Design a protein around this ligand. Structure first.
Ligand SMILES: O=C(O)c1ccc([N+](=O)[O-])cc1
Lengths: 301, 300
């Protein structure tokens, strides 16, 4: 079997966030209210006159809002997209998925996603308590998940829905959110915010390599119509993850009471790093077969 | 907020198997084939004439099979019974489950279960490789799970289906498998078999405490149709976890080639520790209400 997978499985205890920083809760021990929750430098409307026209506390509420929103989206992605793909592999629904090495690598990844959800949930709860955020609108469904559910809606056969769920999860795990990497490195914000994202990023880098190996091994064992289905779904999943939907920015801005929110939003890199998914496509021998224009690899990757 | 929940949440990093023994895979290192997989002492037919009349390799294969069978059932219970209950709580479907302290304790439990699944899956794979078992027959449906399906068939809408899943999960997590506790302490079997079960038991002791606190809080916020449904549900789950299913014994014997497997099973304590479940019952004030005869606490 895959030497990459063997390596990753053996390294998991030395690498995983759950092992090496289970005590993340205690990181709020000596809290400093004076330090921002989110970096202005990565806010797209940061230097817009209408955002600058606001009062300092209003800008701070937007930053806090964007931090909480980012954590909400991470949790929804894990729960709705990434973990269901991993679960399908463990359920043995694809030929070749009964392999002990695939099962070890993916179950380890499932333990990691559980802990990621734990860390991001803690981040929301601590922020909401300490910033005294009593109530906040529960709204927008992920653009990525909306696209998934629409693809699946009329699909007759379970075998094909399984492919779609696998591909959506694979793309999620190989296309790193710019906010994850940018937040991870940021020294201007709450240290627990850059720490949680640093931890998640370390695990996600491994998850991307795992997914590339597992997807190659399963595609190899698939029959032609399964292979055909995987190929069709790739560009559709890729486009869903390339899609910027700034409905969340609007809500945050309106929440903070910023005048001209619709104007600021209607007015608008933070592109994902698609490097991993490009490697995935290469390992499947699909280089020329996928109709997707891959963005350049970010400096931070 | 619950002082129990608080203490268990803050202790989790020191307690959790996932933190303490993430490198469980490496425990197979200097592997000694001479050490048994499973203790004859806790095998219910160990002293049966027809078992004793079988060859030494046949009896050692049964022990291997029962160890693998044990692990298979643990994984199935976690995946089909315990995790769904915990997920339901995190899904916020029940009033009062939005509580951050509840959410931390239960999410930590979910991390634990994913790692328990990992440990047990590893034990199966490493045993199957080292004992050279290339072939193993399909296992029967869990008795506990078959009974769950039955209740869910009888009880209709989404709203009742949530309550049943919750109770099934709660009973599973508060009634400790005799085999869990007896394997954990066994000094004669593969060190990593007693280690995995020692680790799982340490976590499960905490999970039982977590579940009693959570279910109590969720019971308080339920509407009258819901409480009625939960109360009617407790004894059925409890009976389900108390009923013995001999079908998995008949498989290990009929696989290892032991003649008269039917008579052995025909001729056939490993009773769960219901202590945690009894506490759950009193915490709900259903002491007089529940028609279930709790066995005396087992010695272990
Ligand atoms: O930081 C993020 O946005 C992020 C979201 C999801 C995943 N994930 O699918 O595990 C990782 C990072």
């Amino acid at each position: 079997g895959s030497a990459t997978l063997g390596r990753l499985v053996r390294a998991w205890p030395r690498r995983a966030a759950v092992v090496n920083k289970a005590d993340i809760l205690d990181e709020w021990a000596d809290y400093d209210t004076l330090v921002p929750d989110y970096p202005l430098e990565i806010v797209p409307f940061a230097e817009h006159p209408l955002f600058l026209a606001a009062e300092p506390h209003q800008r701070q509420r937007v930053l806090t809002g964007m931090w909480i929103g980012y954590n909400e989206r991470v949790i929804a992605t894990e729960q709705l997209i990434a973990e269901p793909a991993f679960d399908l592999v463990m359920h043995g629904v694809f030929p070749g998925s009964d392999d002990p090495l695939i099962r070890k690598s993916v179950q380890q990844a499932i333990v990691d996603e559980s802990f990621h959800t734990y860390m991001h949930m803690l981040a929301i709860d601590r922020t909401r308590e300490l910033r005294k955020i009593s109530e906040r609108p529960p709204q927008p469904e992920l653009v990525t998940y909306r696209r998934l559910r629409r693809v699946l809606a009329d699909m007759p056969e379970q075998w094909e829905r399984d492919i779609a769920v696998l591909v959506w999860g694979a793309v999620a795990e190989t296309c790193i959110n710019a906010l994850l990497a940018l937040l991870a490195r940021d020294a201007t914000i709450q240290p627990m915010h850059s720490l949680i994202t640093t931890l998640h990023l370390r695990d996600e880098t491994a998850h991307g390599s795992i997914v590339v190996e597992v997807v190659r091994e399963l595609y190899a064992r698939m029959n032609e119509q399964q292979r055909r289905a995987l190929v069709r779904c790739l560009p559709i999943a890729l486009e869903a993850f390339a899609e910027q939907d700034l409905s969340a920015l609007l809500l945050e801005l309106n929440a903070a009471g910023i005048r001209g929110a619709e104007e600021i939003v209607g007015d608008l890199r933070l592109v994902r790093d698609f490097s991993g998914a490009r490697k995935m496509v290469e390992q499947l021998g699909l280089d020329d077969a996928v109709d997707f224009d891959f963005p350049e690899r970010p400096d931070w990757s």
